[PDB]
Design a protein around this ligand. Structure first.
Ligand code: A1BDN
Ligand code: ZN
Ligand code: ZN
Length: 583
């Protein structure tokens, strides 16, 4: 308890010595409270005017327009200790899984140089404002690195002074840049060296991209076995047990020297003991602590969520196959049965899964998996939107399975070749492209973000009539040489380029596509198919509405409206790449 966290707590106490008070009316029940201090501060979603002016029919669709407007009764709940049989299953599986992931990889420290390069190309490293303005300036100043050094040597000594979380759909634990550095130095290798690539982890999809995820699900569907299960966990990050954090820490068993000590300190001092500052309007700042749940950098969180989800799903597969009888206790001969299953078939069983952090698809050996719920529930990985002991409902067709907010279509080109394409309800896609985050956007910066959405649509969602038309309109309305941008950048964004989008389409879908045997390039956008018109409507198309027909017919007028706002620049007309504007 206070031996490991007190020092961090002590230090915050003194910087607000004028304000410290143990509030008697504190709302915490599962979080250990410690004190409050005085602050007074808050980032709403702003509309992208370039995208909205070129998507007029959606101005009267509430599912789009409501997205731009506007549970902590789940962070403040508790998870029970798993039974002894469950703890044994997790420990054997985790031991086995780090060894498999480690066979073709070497753990190593990430460098100041690597960290500096990341900051100088705008990645989301979840850091706070204070002594320097931005991340770019702290990294170019030697004083920073001396603070990093002090903390670094405190960790080698097994103590922590400044590694404190600041809490703020999605929960992010902002730390100061220095604490983020030390996390990256010790555990960055998991992402930097692709430990959760499909080649390395067999279940993982790190670095894949939406042009690959549908082909991966179709390959899983080809295995003999039962339904495809895609059960979401209710509040995954809140269900990570202290036993989970201890099995994750076993990656340190594969390390040596300074690295092993620096990694052991991240896990012991920051992950398995947390210090958090939270804004309460009663506006004060509460200093709360707890031992369990996930609270790490976004990138480390993705890797360890993937690890622990692979572990949980192998165990659910073991339960379905009758490898063990009860979670109450594993007998000595069950332990050897479990180890032997892992050695014998473990890699085959990993290949039956697609796992992206808390998100999974599993094609088990048979449908016994559906009612194999004892280990899953006892590990705390309770399924969302279904009663605890009700058997899972599986999917009979890989094209129906949800994964990473998409489903996937099989789309046959006029020349017979097969595309497996990503898809989701079109209101969601249009609604997101109409939103920006943060202040100080110039018209040029707003235009270049619209262009990023348009090029993503061309590459990933070309098969949706409305999005190929709107993408061509936005690319016609934004100056041809202006570079697409994002302010927040495990997937490949091939659309972030000033290269011709037909050339990028050929590279992604034909040349580098390992599922496409015939490498014959496509010569025009007219060779690139759409979904069936009825399927396009099913997935949210406005094709057939009077509003949509008027928009398509008069698109030049909309393009010209945006060009007139941006001013006298060099523009290209991309509409004649479409049959209906080609005379
Ligand atoms: O566990 C995670 N789940 C998803 C949702 C589906 C893709 C991965 N997102 C994440 C992003 C950062 C960190 C963790 C996660
Ligand atoms: Zn620290
Ligand atoms: Zn669809």
């Amino acid at each position: 308890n206070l031996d490991i966290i007190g020092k961090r707590i002590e230090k915050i106490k003194q910087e607000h010595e004028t304000s410290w008070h143990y509030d008697q009316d504190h709302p915490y029940k599962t979080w250990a409270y410690h004190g409050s201090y005085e602050t007074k501060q808050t980032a709403s979603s702003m509309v992208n005017g370039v995208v909205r002016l070129l998507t007029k029919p959606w101005d009267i669709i509430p599912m789009v327009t409501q997205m731009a407007m506007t549970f902590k009764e789940k962070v403040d709940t508790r998870t029970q200790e798993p039974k002894e049989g469950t703890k044994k299953l997790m420990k054997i599986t985790a031991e086995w899984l780090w060894k498999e992931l480690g066979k073709k990889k070497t753990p190593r420290m990430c460098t100041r140089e690597e960290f500096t390069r990341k900051v100088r190309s705008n990645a989301a490293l979840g850091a706070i404002f204070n002594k320097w303005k931005s991340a770019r300036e702290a990294v170019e100043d030697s004083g920073f690195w001396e603070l990093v050094d002090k903390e670094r040597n405190l960790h080698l000594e097994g103590k922590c002074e400044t590694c404190v979380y600041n809490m703020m759909s999605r929960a992010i634990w902002y730390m100061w840049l220095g604490a983020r550095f030390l996390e990256f130095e010790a555990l960055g290798f998991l992402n930097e060296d692709h430990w959760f690539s499909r080649e390395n982890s067999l279940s993982g999809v790190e670095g894949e991209g939406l042009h690959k995820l549908g082909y991966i699900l179709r390959d899983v569907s080809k295995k003999e076995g039962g339904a495809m299960y895609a059960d979401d966990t209710a509040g995954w990050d809140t269900r990570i047990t202290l036993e989970d954090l201890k099995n994750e820490e076993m990656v340190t068993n594969h390390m040596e020297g300074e690295h092993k000590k620096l990694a052991e300190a991240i896990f012991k001092l920051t992950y398995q003991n947390k210090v958090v500052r939270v804004q309460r309007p009663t506006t004060v700042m509460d200093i709360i602590s707890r031992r369990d749940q996930r609270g790490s950098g976004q990138v480390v969180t993705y890797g360890l969520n993937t690890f622990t989800n692979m572990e949980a799903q192998l165990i659910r597969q073991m339960e379905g196959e009758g490898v063990f009888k009860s979670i109450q206790h594993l007998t000595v001969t069950e332990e050897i049965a479990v180890k032997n299953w892992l050695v014998r078939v473990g890699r085959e069983r990993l290949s039956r899964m697609a796992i992206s952090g808390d998100d999974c698809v599993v094609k088990p050996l048979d449908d016994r998996f559906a009612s194999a719920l004892t280990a899953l529930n006892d590990m705390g990985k309770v399924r969302k939107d279904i009663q605890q002991w009700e058997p899972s409902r599986g999917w009979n067709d890989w094209t129906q399975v949800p994964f990473c907010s998409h489903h996937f279509h099989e789309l046959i080109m006029k020349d017979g070749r097969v595309l497996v394409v990503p898809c989701r309800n079109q209101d969601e896609l249009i609604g997101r492209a109409r939103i920006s985050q943060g202040a100080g956007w110039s018209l040029r910066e707003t235009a270049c973000l619209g262009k990023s959405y348009a090029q993503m649509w061309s590459l990933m969602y070309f098969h949706r009539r409305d999005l190929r038309l709107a993408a061509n309109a936005i690319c016609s309305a934004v100056p041809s040489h202006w570079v697409p941008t994002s302010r927040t950048t495990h997937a490949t964004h091939e659309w972030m380029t000033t290269e011709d989008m037909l050339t990028v389409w050929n590279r992604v879908w034909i040349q580098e596509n390992p599922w496409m045997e015939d490498k014959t390039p496509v010569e025009s956008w007219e060779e690139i198919p759409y979904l069936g018109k009825r399927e396009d409507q099913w997935c949210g198309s406005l094709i057939g509405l009077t509003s949509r027909a008027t928009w398509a017919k008069n698109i030049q007028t909309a393009i010209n409206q945006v060009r007139s706002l941006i001013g006298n620049e060099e523009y290209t007309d991309y509409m004649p790449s479409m049959k209906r504007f080609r005379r």
